[PDB]
Amino acid sequence: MCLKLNLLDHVFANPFMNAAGVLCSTEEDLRCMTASSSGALVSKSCTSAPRDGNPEPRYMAFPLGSINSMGLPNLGFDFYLKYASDLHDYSKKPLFLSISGLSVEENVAMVRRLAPVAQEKGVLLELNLSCPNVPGKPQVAYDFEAMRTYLQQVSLAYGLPFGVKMPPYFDIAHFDTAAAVLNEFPLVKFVTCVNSVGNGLVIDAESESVVIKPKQGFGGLGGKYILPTALANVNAFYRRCPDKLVFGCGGVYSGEDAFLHILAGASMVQVGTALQEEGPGIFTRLEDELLEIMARKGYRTLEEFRGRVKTIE
Amino acid sequence: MCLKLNLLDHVFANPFMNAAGVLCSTEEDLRCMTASSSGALVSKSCTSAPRDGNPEPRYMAFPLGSINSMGLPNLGFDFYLKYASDLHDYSKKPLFLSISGLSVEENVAMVRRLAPVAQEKGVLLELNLSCPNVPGKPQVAYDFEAMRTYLQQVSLAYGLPFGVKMPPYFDIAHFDTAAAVLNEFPLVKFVTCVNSVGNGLVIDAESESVVIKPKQGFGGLGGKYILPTALANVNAFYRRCPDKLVFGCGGVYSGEDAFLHILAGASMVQVGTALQEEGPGIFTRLEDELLEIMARKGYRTLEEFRGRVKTIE
Ligand SMILES: Cc1cc2nc3c(=O)[nH]c(=O)nc-3n(C[C@H](O)[C@H](O)[C@H](O)COP(=O)(O)O)c2cc1C
Ligand SMILES: Cc1cc2nc3c(=O)[nH]c(=O)nc-3n(C[C@H](O)[C@H](O)[C@H](O)COP(=O)(O)O)c2cc1C
Numbered sequence: 276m277c278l279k280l281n282l283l284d285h286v287f288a289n290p291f292m293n294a295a296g297v298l299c300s301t302e303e304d305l306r307c308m309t310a311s312s313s314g315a316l317v318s319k320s321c322t323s324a325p326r327d328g329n330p331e332p333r334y335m336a337f338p339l340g341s342i343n344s345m346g347l348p349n350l351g352f353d354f355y356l357k358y359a360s361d362l363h364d365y366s367k368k369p370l371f372l373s374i375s376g377l378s379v380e381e382n383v384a385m386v387r388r389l390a391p392v393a394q395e396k397g398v399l400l401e402l403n404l405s406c407p408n409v410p411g412k413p414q415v416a417y418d419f420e421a422m423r424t425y426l427q428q429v430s431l432a433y434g435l436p437f438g439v440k441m442p443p444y445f446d447i448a449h450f451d452t453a454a455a456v457l458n459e460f461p462l463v464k465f466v467t468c469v470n471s472v473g474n475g476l477v478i479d480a481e482s483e484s485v486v487i488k489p490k491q492g493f494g495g496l497g498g499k500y501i502l503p504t505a506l507a508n509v510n511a512f513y514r515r516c517p518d519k520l521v522f523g524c525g526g527v528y529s530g531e532d533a534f535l536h537i538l539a540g541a542s543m544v545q546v547g548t549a550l551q552e553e554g555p556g557i558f559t560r561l562e563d564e565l566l567e568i569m570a571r572k573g574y575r576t577l578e579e580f581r582g583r584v585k586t587i588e
Numbered sequence: 589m590c591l592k593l594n595l596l597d598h599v600f601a602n603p604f605m606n607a608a609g610v611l612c613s614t615e616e617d618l619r620c621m622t623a624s625s626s627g628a629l630v631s632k633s634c635t636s637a638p639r640d641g642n643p644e645p646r647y648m649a650f651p652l653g654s655i656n657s658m659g660l661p662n663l664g665f666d667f668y669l670k671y672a673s674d675l676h677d678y679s680k681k682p683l684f685l686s687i688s689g690l691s692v693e694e695n696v697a698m699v700r701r702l703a704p705v706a707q708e709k710g711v712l713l714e715l716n717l718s719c720p721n722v723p724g725k726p727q728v729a730y731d732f733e734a735m736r737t738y739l740q741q742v743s744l745a746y747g748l749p750f751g752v753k754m755p756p757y758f759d760i761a762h763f764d765t766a767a768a769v770l771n772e773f774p775l776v777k778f779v780t781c782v783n784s785v786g787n788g789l790v791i792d793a794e795s796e797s798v799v800i801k802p803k804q805g806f807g808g809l810g811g812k813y814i815l816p817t818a819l820a821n822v823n824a825f826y827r828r829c830p831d832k833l834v835f836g837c838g839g840v841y842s843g844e845d846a847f848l849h850i851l852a853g854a855s856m857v858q859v860g861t862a863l864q865e866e867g868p869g870i871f872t873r874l875e876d877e878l879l880e881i882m883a884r885k886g887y888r889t890l891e892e893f894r895g896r897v898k899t900i901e
């Protein structure tokens with residue numbers, strides 16, 4: 276019948292939204308996502324200052340997914356904060372704002388300013404931990420001590436419920452460690468699994484060349500390549516973080532894919548590459564497809580099957 | 589126009605071989621590989637003692653690839669050593685023997701006994717590091733200190749050129765660190781990139797169930813899902829280990845996929861999931877397809893393009 280749900284003290288028309296970075300950089304983009312049928316929108320991960328990002332071409336797509344090394348091009352935090360404060364129409368749907376500063380200090384600075392807007396307007400924070408770290412070091416979410424510092428500092432500075440965007444993990448010990456870090460922070464109320472699968476390489480056979488310019492062609496992977504990865508991370512954190520919500524992202528092109536994310540434990544379902552490729556019309560299609568599968572199965576609510584993936588014995 | 593390679597003091601009719609674990613567990617399997625058109629074969633990663641492996645179902649394949657949590661079923665080292673020593677016909681093609689002990693000590697014991705057979709018969713060792721150590725710790729190659737210990741101990745015990753099978757990495761810092769570890773060991777003459785992408789999760793929408801029984805459905809991913817991950821790893825180690833060979837594994841279903849591996853840096857090209865699905869006839873197909881690409885491009889040998897992927901600007 277209808278897909279509306281309540282999470283985080285907000286009402287959503289359906290569990291669909293854009294993935295951070297896709298269709299959400301400019302005022303035009305945010306107005307377009309707001310006019311769509313999505314249940315929510317999230318803004319492009321920002322830094323304190325505007326960034327031009329990397330040289331083009333920096334994104335490419337293919338039948339099985341996408342590769343990107345955008346370099347965090349964005350209009351700067353002041354712009355996104357102004358959109359949240361003054362421009363967004365909250366009567367239409369909830370807004371998430373994604374932050375990805377290049378240091379802990381930068382993230383602290385931005386969240387201290389976001390906090391009163393969050394209180395006043397109800398904008399929700401997604402903290403992207405696929406962010407630069409200290410020398411010789413991996414991305415923050417792959418450096419568990421760094422991650423614990425970032426969360427401690429942001430929790431202290433912000434003081435309100437927030438969520439974190441995670442990269443994929445590929446080892447059960449890493450799932451255990453990462454989830455134990457997140458579970459030290461009671462203000463982390465949702466975990467979004469996953470960011471792109473890092474540092475893939477697409478090569479074109481005819482030209483014998485890589486397809487993106489930055490980083491000698493290396494970039495994050497999205498789309499069909501990454502659905503089983505994404506489902507694994509969703510379910511691993513769903514199991515390990517019972518007091519948190521999990522938001523699913525990766526490889527959603529259909530309502531069946533969305534269905535799989537919800538069965539794994541997703542509360543909201545984010546759409547990146549498929550949205551970039553098909554445009555905002557995708558949301559109507561996804562909704563219709565998901566309701567069709569529910570109807571064939573006799574499900575009337577999402578809660579009937581969320582996290583109810585079955586195991587063998 | 590030719591596919592011949594000469595490396596590691598052996599001659600190879602073509603670069604194609606099975607990936608460890610596929611079509612290589614039993615004497616029947618190894619005779620089948622030997623009778624095929626492949627340029628080489630590798631035996632199933634073994635332990636000191638025979639293992640039954642995990643309960644079934646433990647492997648499943650789909651249009652985009654495969655998932656497995658086999659649990660290292662194998663006939664035990666003594667069997668693979670006898671095959672190398674007494675049964676394999678070296679006039680047909682070269683043999684690699686893969687080992688995957690559960691501790692550094694188990695690996696040391698195997699390699700000590702492999703050494704004279706390596707020296708007399710020319711069997712080539714592939715050490716699988718993409719493998720369990722202490723439960724609750726990451727797999728060996730995700731624990732750089734453990735990886736260093738294993739390589740130091742196997743190098744001392746074995747005393748002959750060998751290669752290593754690596755899991756994929758997803759962070760530049762990890763590429764840098766892993767390759768620096770490998771480069772400490774002059775006996776590591778080849779690096780095979782990559783083993784399966786760890787701990788994915790396939791779910792079947794109709795049944796609402798995971799598809800393999802072990803590990804709550806979590807398993808390693810192969811096939812079309814992993815090709816750009818594979819290529820990235822090949823090229824990353826190609827660039828970082830200029831005194832070693834790189835063998836490519838992941839996502840090969842065609843001669844075009846092979847060609848991309850070789851452009852990235854691959855010498856040998858291993859075939860896992862596609863072989864499991866198509867059977868050994870795939871090697872005639874791959875050879876024909878690769879040669880056709882070479883003929884269209886005017887390439888006469890593999891060295892003309894190996895590692896010659898172009899970057900932008
Ligand atoms: C062009 C592009 C830009 C992105 N920028 C961001 C970003 O600013 N913040 C972020 O959290 N993730 C970003 N991502 C990652 C996506 O949010 C998403 O995690 C990933 O693409 C996987 O989802 P998909 O398979 O639907 O593409 C970006 C992805 C693409 C393709
Ligand atoms: C059924 C199965 C068993 C495997 N067992 C092993 C193994 O014993 N040793 C190992 O190094 N890799 C093992 N692997 C990994 C493959 O060698 C290969 O790295 C991986 O499947 C990716 O290649 P692909 O995309 O061609 O499948 C196995 C893979 C499969 C599908």
Ligand SMILES: Cc1cc(CCc2c(C(=O)O)[nH]c(=O)[nH]c2=O)ccc1F
Nearest residue numbers: 343344345346347348403405470471495
């Ligand atoms: C340069 C760079 C930036 C980021 C953060 C922003 C981001 C980007 C990006 O803007 O490149 N792309 C993603 O797929 N995920 C992201 O989280 C992540 C990795 C990077 F290499």
Ligand SMILES: Cc1cc(CCc2c(C(=O)O)[nH]c(=O)[nH]c2=O)ccc1F
Nearest residue numbers: 657658659660661718719720783784808
């Ligand atoms: C003992 C044991 C070994 C491995 C390594 C063997 C292996 C396997 C396996 O036998 O499950 N599957 C893969 O895709 N790659 C591998 O390297 C993986 C799981 C295990 F429990």
